[PDB]
Amino acid sequence: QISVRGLAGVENVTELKKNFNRHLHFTLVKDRNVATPRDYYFALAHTVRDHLVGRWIRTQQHYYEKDPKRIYYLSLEFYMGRTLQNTMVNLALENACDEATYQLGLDMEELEEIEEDAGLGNGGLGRLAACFLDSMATLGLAAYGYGIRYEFGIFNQKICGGWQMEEADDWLRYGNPWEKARPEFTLPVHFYGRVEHTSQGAKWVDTQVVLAMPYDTPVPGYRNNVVNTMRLWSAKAPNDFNLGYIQAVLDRNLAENISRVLYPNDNFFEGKELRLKQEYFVVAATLQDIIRRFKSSTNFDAFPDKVAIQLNDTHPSLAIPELMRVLVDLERLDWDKAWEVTVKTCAYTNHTVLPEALERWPVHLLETLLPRHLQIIYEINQRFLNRVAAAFPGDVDRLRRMSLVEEGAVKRINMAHLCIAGSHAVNGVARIHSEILKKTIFKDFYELEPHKFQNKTNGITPRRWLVLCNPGLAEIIAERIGEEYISDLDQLRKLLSYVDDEAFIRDVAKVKQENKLKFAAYLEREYKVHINPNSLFDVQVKRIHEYKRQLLNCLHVITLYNRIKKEPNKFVVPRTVMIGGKAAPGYHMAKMIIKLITAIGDVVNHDPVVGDRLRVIFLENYRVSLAEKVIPAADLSEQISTAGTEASGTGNMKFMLNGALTIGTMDGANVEMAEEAGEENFFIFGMRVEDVDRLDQRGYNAQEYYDRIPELRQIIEQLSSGFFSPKQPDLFKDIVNMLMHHDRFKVFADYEEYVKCQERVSALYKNPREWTRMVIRNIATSGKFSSDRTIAQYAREIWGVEPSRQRLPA
Amino acid sequence: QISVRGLAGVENVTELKKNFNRHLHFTLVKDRNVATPRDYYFALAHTVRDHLVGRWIRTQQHYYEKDPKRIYYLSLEFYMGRTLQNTMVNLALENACDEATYQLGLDMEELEEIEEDAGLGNGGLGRLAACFLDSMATLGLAAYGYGIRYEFGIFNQKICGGWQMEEADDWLRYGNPWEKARPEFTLPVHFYGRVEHTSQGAKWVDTQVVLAMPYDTPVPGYRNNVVNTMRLWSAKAPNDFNLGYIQAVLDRNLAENISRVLYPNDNFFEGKELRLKQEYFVVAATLQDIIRRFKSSTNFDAFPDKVAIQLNDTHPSLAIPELMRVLVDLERLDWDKAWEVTVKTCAYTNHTVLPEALERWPVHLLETLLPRHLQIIYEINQRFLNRVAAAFPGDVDRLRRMSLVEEGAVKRINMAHLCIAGSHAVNGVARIHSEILKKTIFKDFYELEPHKFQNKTNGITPRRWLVLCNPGLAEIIAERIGEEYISDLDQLRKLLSYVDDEAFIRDVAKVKQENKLKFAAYLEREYKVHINPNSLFDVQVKRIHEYKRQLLNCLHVITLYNRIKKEPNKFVVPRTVMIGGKAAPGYHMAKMIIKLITAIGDVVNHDPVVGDRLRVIFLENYRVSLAEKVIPAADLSEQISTAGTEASGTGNMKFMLNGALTIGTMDGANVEMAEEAGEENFFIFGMRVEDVDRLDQRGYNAQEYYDRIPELRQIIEQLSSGFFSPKQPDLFKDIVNMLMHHDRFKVFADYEEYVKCQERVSALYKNPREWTRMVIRNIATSGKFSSDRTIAQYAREIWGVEPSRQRLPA
Numbered sequence A, B: 001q002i003s004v005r006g007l008a009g010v011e012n013v014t015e016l017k018k019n020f021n022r023h024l025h026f027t028l029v030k031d032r033n034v035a036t037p038r039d040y041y042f043a044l045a046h047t048v049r050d051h052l053v054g055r056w057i058r059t060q061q062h063y064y065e066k067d068p069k070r071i072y073y074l075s076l077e078f079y080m081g082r083t084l085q086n087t088m089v090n091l092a093l094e095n096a097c098d099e100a101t102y103q104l105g106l107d108m109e110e111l112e113e114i115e116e117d118a119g120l121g122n123g124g125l126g127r128l129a130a131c132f133l134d135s136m137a138t139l140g141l142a143a144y145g146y147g148i149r150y151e152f153g154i155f156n157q158k159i160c161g162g163w164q165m166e167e168a169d170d171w172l173r174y175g176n177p178w179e180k181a182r183p184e185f186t187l188p189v190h191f192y193g194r195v196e197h198t199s200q201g202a203k204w205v206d207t208q209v210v211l212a213m214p215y216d217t218p219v220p221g222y223r224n225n226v227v228n229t230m231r232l233w234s235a236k237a238p239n240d241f242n243l244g245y246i247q248a249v250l251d252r253n254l255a256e257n258i259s260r261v262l263y264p265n266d267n268f269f270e271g272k273e274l275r276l277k278q279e280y281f282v283v284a285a286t287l288q289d290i291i292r293r294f295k296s297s298t299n300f301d302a303f304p305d306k307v308a309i310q311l312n313d314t315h316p317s318l319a320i321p322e323l324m325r326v327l328v329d330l331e332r333l334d335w336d337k338a339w340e341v342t343v344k345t346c347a348y349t350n351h352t353v354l355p356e357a358l359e360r361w362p363v364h365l366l367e368t369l370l371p372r373h374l375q376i377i378y379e380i381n382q383r384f385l386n387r388v389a390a391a392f393p394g395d396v397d398r399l400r401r402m403s404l405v406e407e408g409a410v411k412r413i414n415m416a417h418l419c420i421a422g423s424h425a426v427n428g429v430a431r432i433h434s435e436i437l438k439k440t441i442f443k444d445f446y447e448l449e450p451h452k453f454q455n456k457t458n459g460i461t462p463r464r465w466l467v468l469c470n471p472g473l474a475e476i477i478a479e480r481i482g483e484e485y486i487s488d489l490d491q492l493r494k495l496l497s498y499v500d501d502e503a504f505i506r507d508v509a510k511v512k513q514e515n516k517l518k519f520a521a522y523l524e525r526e527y528k529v530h531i532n533p534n535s536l537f538d539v540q541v542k543r544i545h546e547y548k549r550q551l552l553n554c555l556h557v558i559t560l561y562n563r564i565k566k567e568p569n570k571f572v573v574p575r576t577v578m579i580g581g582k583a584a585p586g587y588h589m590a591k592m593i594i595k596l597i598t599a600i601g602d603v604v605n606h607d608p609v610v611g612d613r614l615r616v617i618f619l620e621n622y623r624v625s626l627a628e629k630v631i632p633a634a635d636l637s638e639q640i641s642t643a644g645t646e647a648s649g650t651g652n653m654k655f656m657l658n659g660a661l662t663i664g665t666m667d668g669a670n671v672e673m674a675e676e677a678g679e680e681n682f683f684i685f686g687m688r689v690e691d692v693d694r695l696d697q698r699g700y701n702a703q704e705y706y707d708r709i710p711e712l713r714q715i716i717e718q719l720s721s722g723f724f725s726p727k728q729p730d731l732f733k734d735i736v737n738m739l740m741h742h743d744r745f746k747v748f749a750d751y752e753e754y755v756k757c758q759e760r761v762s763a764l765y766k767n768p769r770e771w772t773r774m775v776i777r778n779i780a781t782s783g784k785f786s787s788d789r790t791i792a793q794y795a796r797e798i799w800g801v802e803p804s805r806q807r808l809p810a
């Protein structure tokens, strides 16, 4: 049908049909009389999987023969979403599979909707890992993602009476056709025990053993026949575990709970023992696998020439002392040599500066669970502080600030300090964030070792986030500038030559309108809600957190409602305001924010005077597959975190690539997006980082804003008095009290500029031609935000390897 | 190579090779450079599985179209063993697969040894269910086996310092290629709650729900292209289960524990709540599936014309009140009509008379777990006793003896009484056992309803238990009388015409000698033990239980040792005495018996005066795959239970078919085996049932035997004084005390006759020609003990269906 989806040749279509029928019969054990739609989905998935396996085997053989430096990306989260369509895109099979299934009397889009998201992450951090795997394969790097195969991923969100309810995400219930269990590479992981000191050195003895069983998932690159591996570990009890008899077998569940469930926190450190076990489990299994692969080509001097380990925040920070443990205790390297190898092998990426997100583990927990690792950490600390003291003699407060060990009621280990000490490179994830690291939280470390500190601005894969989710846009671009941009996104700059082309302007606007109609129809069918598709689609989708300021958006929505009620017969640009995202189950204020959004919706959506001029919709169960539907349909992207809090953001980039304009603060990657597009093509408002600092020095007093802004005062009175909760008048008192007295994120301070800026958005939307010209200027300058650019920078500047766009043979 | 293994045609061999390579590449994702032997096993299993699926689909379609009466065999145990070789035998693929694998450079026998036993039973009861499934498919019955998919089957037995240690049987660790998950037929099962009485009738409300997910395994018939289904249920928590958040997800394990592990008891009722949950789980899921299939062809009058439910002991006895519950509470049938349907649908097979094996559930457990079922049981009881009182007016003691409710400190439900009341047929499993049922434990029931009571003597499948495990014997038989006997075992009678044929005598003896050499070599390789293969192989393999009298065998072994020590330079027929079997983990005396056997071995096997004249070997981890190796190698089969205790036995039959002579009591099916072969061709000894009864009336006094038999007294003194446990002199005091004062199974009473009978065995073994002639007379008359004969009798006399040997089209 459309060119970017590839060729549907007669021989390919015939072969796919015959393999589809083969899998239906032999793999699924069904015929066409009893087959369900889910059976047809599986028959297609197995058919497509067959095209991966030859390439997967050949890729891994190629790495064995050439022995390149291997890159190991360690993460507690990989937010993969669905695999079927992405695999077809990367193998150039989409049109052929569409035709094959069409000839069999089936609709491939319907079959795609049956697949479960692999929801093994919380949001941006986990999704970044997934984009990165795609880019590493597309750039021909010998890369492996290592994580945990959680039985239950991020919870499914239901809304009941306007409140979030959680249910378990039993994503493996029907099977996962993409993974391959590799029980033969099962490895032991040790916990508890104690340390014995012999004449041979230290020995970690009397431990409890849990087995780590790997499951491998293929990661195809874009049309280059490279298929890399994501290896995820699952916890298994040994067969003699606890071995009355029946209880001993039932108690195997205690060991196997390590891989049972993803902790559903975003930017919040809980400090639970089970989480620490997960972190060690992934590190310990991964490092043994790394060392095994290294030996199967004594001389650990070459280890950093053959191995790079990238730590995705501090969650796998135990890799540093575990590598030391293996090299010193088991391989018998001297301490100094082991440390040289460790530092040259490891690099650390920081993804947040929020104090509540930083991992600080109590010493008593580490002492019980990982006694040898605690000894190694103390020795690392003593040697590190010896260097600090030599560089800054007499600066005793610096020694306490830089220590890996924090004093207090409970002593804790600061895992970020450990990562900096044991890594040859430390990076932030957007220019402003990397600068904040050097100026504030890691200032002392930057002064000791300035050469370590780098920036690597985040990116997104244009395969999933343009070609897959928005084929109509991909196609109209390809008609003008060809297909090369899909693996070289900088080529989108060529679209600046079409900003005054009437045909291109029309086509850009038509694709958006089609995506809006398709999304409006999705909302009616799956959720029985009716929206005006000629309205401006104003979208804020991301996890619910005070720093992301969904509350500021709520204040604007109420403002627009109150303005309509005051002058009902005045024209206003119609909007559909859509907010979605999950709250962590223990985060009370986040749950109250969800309830506020649905309560505003209950009033606004049923007021006959408003009509279809304003609708407020809470999008339930926001996840990767829903992002693929709503992002292409958006007109306005809300990126409104308090300056200095969103380390980068990546949703911002997805919206830019898909033809939405951005309203946002000068935070994270928003700064660089505005720089690339031109500030005149971005709706920038609010305090800069420097203005937030100036308010903090004087002291933030929310009452001042309340006193001076009548429109704001009206909203707070409506919230307090029960206007949005008539049956429960005090329902929102916690929200009002927080805004008025304890607001760390200064919602009222940006209210006036935000509302004024929103008025400018409305003004531009009334001139469709000029709106669309501005959109073109955004799409055309989005090239920098390809994760292919990001990964090429990590490769050259951190890992010491050269990317390649060359194809392996088919 | 050998004819009974089928044809190896060039086209078949070529096709198997190409599919093997296809599965290695696409299914397993390996090439020949990295493939392990386990990978080759899986590639072969998938290749053979492909030949089943066309037949499986066609068989189930055929039943849908013809709508025959369906037979549902309900069991808590299916002791299947390995599937690969059995599948090849039943599809006539064995020689073709041997050739195909040979051409690929692989040894198929080595690959067969990689497969795990499906150990989902304890012993005879579970294995009988497996033989029965094979016979039902071979006889073309529309039959389904329904059970539980235990995650952990019967434990793996290790012997450490002569003691049994248990380890978990993690049989699913590498995957099971034979099963197919059917998550689409998942059904809810209810527990706890309470009963509400409305004007519409009773309602069971406020229940906890567990989901039952079915896994289907194909059951191929012998060369008839019929493939039936074994459906096993696995427990799953619903997604809203317990829905802080993390603990709620972890606590899903409480529901899922229902299918976690097989209770490892043989003939011993423990009475644990988890076991009751297992029993209801299997019944409730199965009955819904049955009713669904019945409706998918209001009128339950035809239900018993389309459905038969066979209850394998009382373990699924809750099927009776569950069927009543569904018909009365949900379908709104009147009680009397529902009862008529239930009785005509259900039939009960009893497999034991031991008092400690009979299920008697406390009322307080049923009241909490299954409150509606308890109400229905009480109503069944009241109506049943009303009939008893009308038939035997004034007989108040009969009313108390026959009640389903037993009075006492704790009130209990007698599940056997429930099964008799609610079934149209009740059978025992050997003639003597069925007679015991009518004369003793069910005498009252027999007097009320004599027409209900039947016999169905047990059998074994000649596919697994001759063709598969002893191809050399199958072949030499086929050379004389053709292949038809494999599905018509009565044809073995034709071998009586060869009892004086010198060539046949030679061949029978040669096959035994080959099997003995092969087994002697297996023992050296896997267990580092050396045996004389010219010795008489004296074998007792079965679960360890006081009633089976492994202790009587021990007394004979010590007797032979003491006789050698007394006259070292006298000739004695050399023996290798092999004893194997598992003890239930909580059964202390059974564990002590294992320790005694290994302790006797420690003395006997290292005495230089004995030499290779006597060896005592404990065969570790006895299970179906070990039975297939040792049974063909045996000369003497030990079947020495106290008369009246072994309901049938089936190991006895396996040994008879494979060319061993039997030493045994007139117990269970031993009576019928002796009748078929002629008493002159059997080594019968000991008390008959009537003699045991006479001793019980006078009172058993073990001291009398001790006082009168010097050889017995010497053994007891050796045990007591520490001769077999020099480091721990009192180790065996519990055994001595039991034998002398509390022996329910009268070991000393059969000692003299047993030893004398063993002397006659030795005498015959010295004349190989006459030994072999007697063997031929046993093999030739073993036809009655085919499970095909057993199943044909159930079909005609209980289920009301006609067996068929006709082939479905290929």
Ligand SMILES: O=C(O)c1ccc2cc(-c3n[nH]c([C@@H]4O[C@H](CO)[C@@H](O)[C@H](O)[C@H]4O)n3)ccc2c1
Pocket: A122, A124, A125, A128, A263, A264, A265, A266, A267, A268, A269, A270, A271, A275, A313, A351, A352, A357, A358, A429, A458, A646, A647, A648, A649, A650, A668
């Ligand atoms: O469960 C926990 O203990 C825990 C603790 C901290 C956590 C921090 C994060 C986390 N830190 N930074 C992040 C996000 O990472 C993205 C990719 O670079 C950034 O675009 C985004 O601005 C940032 O908020 N997520 C996620 C889960 C966590 C879970």
Ligand SMILES: O=C(O)c1ccc2cc(-c3n[nH]c([C@@H]4O[C@H](CO)[C@@H](O)[C@H](O)[C@H]4O)n3)ccc2c1
Pocket: B122, B124, B125, B128, B263, B264, B265, B266, B267, B268, B269, B270, B271, B275, B313, B351, B352, B357, B358, B429, B458, B646, B647, B648, B649, B650, B668
């Ligand atoms: O775990 C329990 O509660 C429990 C209770 C009773 C049990 C009884 C048996 C059981 N009863 N009879 C049997 C065996 O069934 C075979 C097939 O008909 C007979 O050949 C054999 O003589 C008999 O002992 N096993 C098995 C497991 C049990 C488990």
Ligand SMILES: *Cc1c(COP(=O)(O)O)cnc(C)c1O
Pocket: A122, A123, A124, A127, A541, A542, A543, A622, A623, A624, A627, A648, A649, A650, A651, A652, A654
């Ligand atoms: C991209 C993405 C995120 C991150 O969005 P931000 O606006 O950068 O927080 C979160 N969740 C999902 C499902 C995503 O696809």
Ligand SMILES: *Cc1c(COP(=O)(O)O)cnc(C)c1O
Pocket: B122, B123, B124, B127, B541, B542, B543, B622, B623, B624, B627, B648, B649, B650, B651, B652, B654
């Ligand atoms: C046949 C068999 C049994 C039953 O043997 P009996 O001697 O009848 O108790 C027990 N276990 C296994 C593994 C079997 O094959």
